[model samples]
Target: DITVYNGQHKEAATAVAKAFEQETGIKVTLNSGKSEQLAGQLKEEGDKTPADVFYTEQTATFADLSEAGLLAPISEQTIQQTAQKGVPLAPKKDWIALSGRSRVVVYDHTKLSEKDMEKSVLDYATPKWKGKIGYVSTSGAFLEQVVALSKMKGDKVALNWLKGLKENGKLYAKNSVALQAVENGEVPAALINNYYWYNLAKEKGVENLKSRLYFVRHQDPGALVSYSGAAVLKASKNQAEAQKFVDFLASKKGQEALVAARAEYPLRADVVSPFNLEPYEKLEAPVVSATTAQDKEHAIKLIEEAGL
Candidate 1:
């Protein structure tokens, strides 16, 4: 039996967890939640952490564990088998990406014109857009954006951008609700992942969509491209089982379950997203790595400094 600290959406995590169990006959105990919480749990438990594997929706937390020496190095065989497709999936040798998500700005069609889409996400903090934008202040995607900016730019610049958003934007509890706010005409635009808009469109009907999604074309912080990753915990007694669990996640079967359960892009080579959604290569996402994004501590401190 293996214990899992799953940070992926419950549906997707349970689906894949069950599949891993059925195929490998390894019993799994799954505890799923926001990536930050599970990561925090692992941090607190440290060497005594009960979790055998940490499966997460974003890279930063995986990176955090990797930095803390809480993760075991993955085998070269798994890496070589899964590395053929997109960018290198591993930030370190310890954890590997299983799927990806793209950041975007969702805007009410009636509130913002096409020209307004050309402005960088940072521009939303400007006086012209103050009190007109919304973002999920607690989202891992949002935190990743801040971490990427701190790396690409400077700490002062990243802190200033966060502060500006704190002053200018409405904070949402979730990205989906923020998009709904955009749809309901409460906000002109909101920063969120592209899939949120697509999933909402699927539910409400595309023709009825009040908001449109736009990606920041350049390699900007707003265009941060990140992944759902898995890692085997170093403290786990069943390291082989844990490694097999992670390897299965990067396998075609696990990735296929991801497509069905979440409607997000699978990390497997030759997999394409739904036709309604923009394909991976076409998103023009930033070129940051999990190693670089491991700055969650600094990012949260800056978020706190911003009074967000």
Candidate 2:
């Protein structure tokens, strides 16, 4: 039996895990809930985590687990193909990156032109942009971006920017909600992952959103790159089988299912993403490390600084 602990991205989780089990004849169980709680569980269980595998939606949690020494080391080959530059250290030794999401601003083209909002996320703090920016905060993905921005910039900049964002940007429960707010001209635009708005627009077949999807300048401080992290726990009594599942996950066959469900791209550059392949090339992802959570006490400070 193979147990996989799931956090956010439930649909993508089940789709890929089910395929792995069917192909390998390994019975699978998905223990679903929040990532932090699950991380704590894995920590408490230590080498005895009932879960042979753990999946997360962002790099910070993966870094946290790796820092805790709860993760097993990842493999070398997987590391080369899957991990991106400047991010989460592969865990369980080099478990590869499974999925990724880039950060950007979603706005109402009607109220603001393609050039209305400036490049860096910090610019939103300027009084000229107040009440124009917006964002979502139901999950740690956003928080992780906050931490990344703080690392790339500094605490003073991170905090001031976040306070500006909090003060200038309206709050939403979900990125999609934020997108909608911008689409309806309620707030002009909100910051969010590129796929969140595109996915819904793709489903709704909305025509006006063509200009709605915009990436911030050169993938500035607000340009957050996120990933779905997977690790094989050391407690897995079936280490060989666990490795096999990990192998299957990093394989092309496993990654395709993730793209089908969540519009995610395989971590490797060789695989095609759900969106136009060229846009990704144009994306100026900021240089924040996936393992930026190396200092949590400081990350917490950034989050507080962002006024989130």
Candidate 3:
């Protein structure tokens, strides 16, 4: 009676849930979609939700849920066995980070230098990096991260920065398109999820993908780390069973699934991702408190600045 809901990475969701059900005799179900859509649905369903476990692609969405007081603290076994040191600021919050992706500026190596690749994303606002960077606005998760920067700099400063970037950078409707933009040297660089670069490199085998990644900061707000989060809804008819299902996924067995699925990165510093991106701790992005995102209007304002 374990229902696992995922916002992204469908195959990994199926792989992990299938294996968990097969091994433990617990029936597992999966619900998947864009992270923000699930987050909105979860809020509407509220305490009435039948979901026992909640998982998402963005840590920000999960962080918002935890902020909403919708999640129950995960079990201690999960904390000790599977949790990473700095993933969700509240690892024990109603949900836990199952996996992660880093915000990196992928650039064409032919047009850019190693130094250009290493500059932080915030630097893109500068004249030196202007017209050299780009990103998309349709993805709500991306909006959350960028909107978060507004909070980092406060309203006025944040808005100005975003508007400036909008003026300076070309916009894309999707990450793959953004990746393609970078691959074709349209902007020379693009702000994208780390895994997209991996997917491109692996699928196209285009060595020219010479796209390099730049983490904005030491791994705090600038180099935001997104999550694939999971939590069982309180009203789930199968609360106890749901908890059990959650326990199994957050256990050691579940963490290893991340490595096996090269499509995503492991949030835990302990698990090694097949993609070979830098360790999760090095990304230093923002740790968004759930309360911060409940105000979607506020988040949207930041999004608008980015031309969303």
Candidate 4:
């Protein structure tokens, strides 16, 4: 039996856990929460934590744990599985990417065409886009982009960009809300992860969708590719079982189970997305590591200072 601290989407995590249990005959337990909340809990619990595995929606949680020595090195076999998929891995080998999402603009087709869209995400911060852009300040995916932006261009540049956004962009409580604003023409565009648009398109039917996705592939922060990852806890009593579970997540079977429940790109190369997403290989995301992206505290503070 293994207890998983699952910060990934509930449906997708449950699907993977059910598949793992059915195949291996190992009882699985899940404790779900926001990745940041769960990461704080794990840190406080330290070696006495009951969690055997940590599955997250973003790499920062895994990076934070690895930095705090709360994570164990994943087996080389599991690492090789992700390597074969060509997904980014934790430089320290403490975690493996399970799936990926790209940051993109969701814009109203009636208001703006692809050619009319900004070539860079930073362009949205300018006065030209005032009252025309929407964004979710609290989203993990959004913060990952901020961290990437801070790393690639320096904190001062990142802060100024965020300030520009605060001055020009509308704040939404969630990505879905922001995307809806775009669809309703309440705003011309919104910053969001690609899956939100895909999920809505699946629900509403693609042709029925009034808003379309704009991919920024110029190695800009807006083009950043963020990964969801899994790690084994250092304090787990069931080390081998935890390793098996993590390995399964990167395996072909687990990838299928996970993707069936969500719109994220599977870390495995052989699995095809049902949604006709832009190919992952062509995203041209800036090179930012999990460790660098884990600087969430600093990013959040800057965001606050910028009044976003």
User: Local distance difference test, per candidate?
Assistant: 0.79, 0.71, 0.67, 0.85
* Segments of candidate 4 deviating more than 4 angstroms: 84-88
Candidate 3 local Cα displacement, residue 183, angstroms: 2.3
Give one digit per residue, the lDDT tens place, for model 3 in 1-308.
76666776776688778767777788888888777777778888888776677776665566566667777776765755545544554544566667766677777878777675544455676666667777776764566566566556677766666776777767788887888887776779877788888766767774646776666666445577656667767667777777777676666566666456645776544667666766665666666543245445676767665564
Q: Which candidate do you rate higher for lDDT, 1 or 2?
A: 1
Q: On residues 150-226, what C-alpha lDDT tens digit does candidate 1 reach at each position?
A: 87887898888888888888889998799889999898898888777777787788889989988776677777776
lDDT of 4 by residue, 1-308 (tens): 99999888787789899999998999999999988899989999999999999998887777667778899898777777766332567777888888888899989997689999888888898899999899888988889888888888888888988999899999999887999888887999999998888888889998998899999887888988788889999999999899999998988888888777778888776787777778877887777766454387888888988987
Pairing residues by index, what is the TM-score of model 3?
0.82
Ranking by lDDT: 4, 1, 2, 3
lDDT of 2 by residue, 53-166 (tens): 888776567666676776666677776667665446553463456777877777776667776767677776667777777777555667776677667887777777777767
Question: Between candidates 1 and 3, which one is better according to TM-score?
Answer: 1
Candidate 3: residue 256 lDDT (0-100):
66
Q: Which regions in candidate 2 have their CA more than 4 angstroms from the true location?
A: 91-94, 208-211, 292-294, 305-307
Report how far residue 214 has shifted in candidate 1, in Å.
0.8
Candidate 4, clashing residue pairs?
Answer: none
Measured over all alpha carbons after superposition, the RMSD of each candidate to the real structure, in angstroms, is 2.6, 2.5, 3.3, 2.1
Residue 225, candidate 1: alpha-carbon lDDT: 70
